[PDB]
């Protein structure tokens, strides 16, 4: 259940983000589930889930540049570069200590 | 905040040339002030124009134009407008007080938020030492005590008189004075200005290459000066780097940085008042540093009344230096200052009982009385600091008995 | 406008048989191409031949008093009118 | 550049070898604005000036009234 729900959500996120109406541009060959009584239903679900993760992962990392977003969050929140916040405290030292 | 560098005398100018060459190399600034292809902050030490040129904030002061000419020609990006050209030198400094006061006020106005004054000068520099001694007085008077001063004074290897006269004002007005001896520098080398330049450049590394902590000079200095009387610092440098047989781990850097042979001043048994170690490498293993800190705390003899804490800053190496191995600098506050000050006082007394060369300074009866009272005050101040450093060693320092 | 009409009629009615005889992907692509072309030409006119920025600058120059010499001339000349 | 969250996405992680409609369509050094966008742009530019902090209608009196009172003083 989790795999099905997350595969569908991830493909929906990809379509809504990159604007594609459907995945025609990729021209990939896909196999559909032939029947509910087929023996490879779990394998097909796993393959679809892996495809969805592959696409969404590459979107986030290559396209949306998530690795740099991690460094930006580190700097802004945990002061991995403390120069700016030091200037801020110095500039407003009298105010910050007031009630 | 921004810092202003003051260079006084021939030795000061040469050391400053090496220092600025090192700093420009670290920030990739070319000799003409043009940039080279930001996360670092050279603005604290260089003025940036709206035409993309970096010029040093330093001010050059010397009695003769040959040294200044060499320094300016070697580094064309110096601003010529900042160039200006013992008792006789100090009286000469009184005459030029207005020009120098305005000259320094120009640099202070040019920066946005001043932090501290750096001073490169030699105590044994003769006339230049006199003009620098006057510089300290005028700066401290006009700017009050809100802005602190750091003096990288070079100690000496008739000289005793000059050393005492300069040390009186060095004690009175400086806020954090480094001590360097040419004897220990040439012993380490077994030119010499390249060690002082390296130490001074590394001391401010956390400011120019920001990290998680130690973003200001106040934090760096306050860890080493518990009392304004004990203001003299001993610096240690690890020389074994860039060779094949370098220190294999930062932990061995922490253990072997404490060797007495690497210290930049003559030392027997000493008690440490405060510690702070610089480690500068692209990547630093935390667990090695934790083990080294524990061993360093268990090995080093601190004075009883100090918190007994060892601080290690995790400096970041410059992108413009290609993948070089780890290097590190150690700055300490020891009670070893009593030995060198006692040596200076012994020389001064030996040469003051014998009226050897005082004729060059005593011009008349009023001059005799003036020089006598000045010398007595300087001697008393030096004895006072020796007694303070000696009372720090004992355990009854905080007792009112 | 006529050139555009011919160009895109040659796609709707010659390449295909109308909007109905077009899959959604190709229909969206066609509309996107038309949108880009139309706004490109609208810019090339309005900020081109019309020079929108220059006339906005002149609006600021005259209405917001910038050319003070002209207004001083008006006031000195019309001080009696 | 009117930098926006949609301009952030670099779509070239997709292969996208093709370009459309053609190389004949210029790139114009100015943001492509719709008609309503141009109207709104000029309207906001004027509104910012006329409704500035000093020129707004907000001693329970506005700044404009005080300025005009001083102007009447100068006229007198």
Whether A17 sits inside 8 A of D14 (CB atoms) is: no
Its sign, for the CA torsion B74, B3, B220, B175, is positive
Closest CA to B206 of B257, B111, B278, B150: B278
Minimal Cβ distance to C39: which of D20, D34, D42: D34
Cis bond upstream, residue D21 (ω within 30): yes
Whether the CB-CB separation of B258 and B299 falls below 8 Å is answered with yes
Using a CB-CB cut-off of 8 Å, the residues of chain A touching C25 are: 21-22, 24
Give B53's DSSP letter: -
Give B97's DSSP letter: H
Size of interface A-C (CB pairs under 8 A): 6
Whether the CB-CB separation of B315 and B280 falls below 8 Å is answered with yes
Which residues, 6+ apart, have CB-to-CB distance to D2 below 8 Å?
Answer: D31
Residues 11-30 of A with CB under 8 A from C: 21-22, 24
CA Rg value for chain A? 23
Chain D residues contacting A, CB < 8 Å?
8-11, 13-14, 16
Report the neighbours of A using a cutoff of 3 or more CB pairs below 8 angstroms: B, C, D
Using a CB-CB cut-off of 8 Å, the residues of chain B touching A78 are: 212
Which two tokens mark A82? 């403390």
Whether the CB-CB separation of B152 and B185 falls below 8 Å is answered with no
Picking from A56, A59, A63 by the largest number of D CB atoms within 10 A of its own CB, the best residue to mutate is A63
SS3 state of residue B83 = strand
Distances from the Cα of D53 to the Cαs of B70, B206, D41, D43, in angstroms?
57, 43, 20, 17
C25 touches chain A (CB under 8 A): yes
Q: What are phi and psi of B122, to 5 degrees?
A: -110, 130
Closest chain C CA to residue D24:
C37
Whether the CB-CB separation of B236 and B331 falls below 8 Å is answered with yes
Using a CB-CB cut-off of 8 Å, the residues of chain C touching D24 are: none
In angstroms, rounded to a whole number, what is the distance separating the alpha carbons of residues B355 and B231?
32
Using a CB-CB cut-off of 8 Å, the residues of chain D touching A65 are: 10
Using a CB-CB cut-off of 8 Å, the residues of chain A touching D17 are: none
Distances from the Cα of C66 to the Cαs of B326, D10, D49, in angstroms?
62, 43, 15
In angstroms, rounded to a whole number, what is the distance separating the alpha carbons of residues D58 and A80?
44
**Strands B232-237 and B327-334, bridge-based pairing:** antiparallel
Whether A22 sits inside 8 A of C28 (CB atoms) is: no
Its sign, for the CA torsion A65, A67, A71, A74, is positive
Whether A63 sits inside 8 A of D16 (CB atoms) is: no
Furthest-apart CA atoms within chain B: distance in Å: 68
Q: Are D and C touching by the rule of 3+ CB pairs within 8 Å?
A: yes
SS3 state of residue B3 = strand
Experimental technique: cryo-EM
Using a CB-CB cut-off of 8 Å, the residues of chain B touching A89 are: none
Picking from B3, B210, B212 by the largest number of A CB atoms within 10 A of its own CB, the best residue to mutate is B210
A88 touches chain B (CB under 8 A): no
User: How many helices, marked H, and strands, marked E, lie in chain D?
Assistant: 3, 0
Closest CA to B318 of B351, B280, B285, B291: B280
In angstroms, rounded to a whole number, what is the distance separating the alpha carbons of residues B211 and B317?
11
Whether D21 sits inside 8 A of C46 (CB atoms) is: no
Which residues precede chain breaks (C–N over 2.5 Å) in chain B? 37, 85, 157, 190, 267
Whether B211 sits inside 8 A of A86 (CB atoms) is: no
Give B122's DSSP letter: B
C28 touches chain A (CB under 8 A): yes
């Amino acid at each position: 259940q989790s795999k099905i729900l997350n595969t569908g959500k991830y493909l929906n996120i990809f379509k809504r983000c990159t604007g594609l109406h459907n995945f025609e541009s990729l021209k990939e060959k896909l196999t559909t589930i032939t029947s509910l009584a087929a023996p490879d239903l779990e394998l097909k679900i796993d393959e679809f889930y892996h495809r969805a993760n592959k696409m969404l992962m590459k979107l986030l990392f290559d396209g949306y540049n998530f690795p740099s977003v991690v460094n930006i969050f580190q700097r802004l929140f945990l002061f991995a570069d403390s120069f700016q916040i030091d200037n801020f405290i110095d500039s407003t030292f009298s105010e910050l200590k007031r009630g | 905040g921004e810092t202003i560098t003051l260079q006084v005398g021939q030795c000061g100018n040469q050391v400053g040339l090496q220092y600025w060459q090192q700093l420009a190399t670290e920030h990739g600034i070319q000799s003409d002030g043009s940039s080279t292809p930001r996360n670092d902050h050279p603005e604290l030490f260089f003025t940036l124009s709206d035409s993309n040129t970096y010029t040093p904030r330093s001010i050059l002061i010397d009695m003769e134009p040959s040294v200044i000419a060499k320094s300016t020609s070697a580094l064309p990006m110096f601003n010529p407008r900042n160039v200006h050209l013992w008792i006789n030198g100090y009286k000469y400094g009184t005459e030029e007080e207005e020009t120098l006061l305005n000259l320094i006020d120009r640099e202070v106005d040019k920066c946005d938020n001043l932090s501290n004054f750096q001073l490169f000068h030699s105590v044994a520099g003769g006339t230049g030492s006199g003009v620098g001694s006057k510089m300290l007085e005028v700066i401290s008077d006009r700017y009050g005590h809100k802005k602190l001063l750091n003096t990288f004074s070079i100690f000496p290897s008739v000289q005793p008189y000059n050393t005492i006269l300069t040390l009186k004002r060095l004690i009175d007005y400086s806020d954090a004075t480094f001590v360097f001896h040419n004897d220990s520098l040439n012993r380490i080398e077994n030119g010499a200005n390249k060690l002082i330049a390296l130490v001074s450049a590394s001391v401010s590394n956390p400011l120019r290459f920001p990290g998680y902590m130690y973003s200001s000079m106040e934090s760096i200095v306050s860890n080493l000066i518990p009392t304004p009387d004990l203001k003299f610092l001993t610096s240690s440098i690890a020389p074994f780097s860039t060779q094949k047989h370098n220190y294999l781990n930062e932990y061995d850097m922490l253990l072997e940085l404490s060797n007495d042979r690497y210290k930049t001043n003559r030392v027997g048994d000493t008690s440490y008042i405060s510690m702070l170690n610089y480690l500068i490498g692209d990547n630093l293993d935390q667990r090695e540093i934790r083990k080294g800190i524990l061993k360093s705390q268990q090995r080093i003899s601190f004075v009883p009344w100090v918190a007994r804490s060892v601080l290690v800053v995790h400096g970041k190496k410059s992108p413009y230096l290609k993948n070089t191995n780890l290097e590190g600098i150690q700055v300490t506050n020891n009670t070893s200052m009593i030995d060198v000050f006692t040596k200076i006082l012994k020389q001064f007394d030996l040469l003051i009982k014998r009226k050897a060369y005082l004729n060059r300074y005593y011009s008349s009866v009023e001059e005799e009385n003036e020089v006598m009272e000045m010398f007595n005050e300087s001697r008393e101040s030096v004895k006072s600091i020796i007694d303070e450093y000696k009372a720090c060693k004992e355990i009854t320092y905080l007792d009112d008995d | 406008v006529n050139q555009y009409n011919v160009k895109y009629s040659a796609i709707l009615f010659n390449n295909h048989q109308g909007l109905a005889s077009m899959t959604t992907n190709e229909m969206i692509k066609l509309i996107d191409s038309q949108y880009n072309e139309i706004l490109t030409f609208l810019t090339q006119i309005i900020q081109g031949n019309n020079k929108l920025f220059t006339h906005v600058y002149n609006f600021k120059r005259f209405y917001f008093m910038e050319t003070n010499d002209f207004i001083d001339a008006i006031m000195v000349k019309g001080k009696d009118v | 550049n009117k930098n926006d969250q949609d301009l952030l996405l670099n779509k070239s992680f997709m292969n996208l070898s093709e370009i459309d409609p053609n190389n004949d369509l210029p790139k114009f050094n100015v943001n492509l604005l719709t008609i309503d966008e141009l109207v709104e742009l000029h309207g906001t530019y004027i509104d910012s000036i006329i409704n500035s902090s000093l020129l707004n209608e907000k001693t329970n009196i506005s700044y404009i009234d005080q300025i005009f009172n001083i102007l009447q003083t100068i006229f007198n």
